[PDB]
């Protein structure tokens, strides 16, 4: 997604 860790996105 718009902000977070690599595998969240």
Residue 8 phi, psi (nearest 5)? -80, -55
Residue 3: exposure state from Cβ atoms within 10 A (0-12, 13-18, ≥19): exposed
* Distance from the Cα of residue 5 to its chain's centroid: 4
> Using CA atoms, how far apart are residues 6 and 2, in angstroms rounded to an integer?
11
> What is the residue whose two structure tokens read 């996105």?
9
Both tokens assigned to 8: 């969240």
Contact 1/7 with Cβ under 8 angstroms?
Answer: no
Contact 2/8 with Cβ under 8 angstroms?
Answer: no
First to last CA, the chain: 4
Three-state SS string across the chain, please? Answer: CCCCCCCCC
């Amino acid at each position: 997604x718009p902000y977070x860790p690599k595998d969240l996105x």
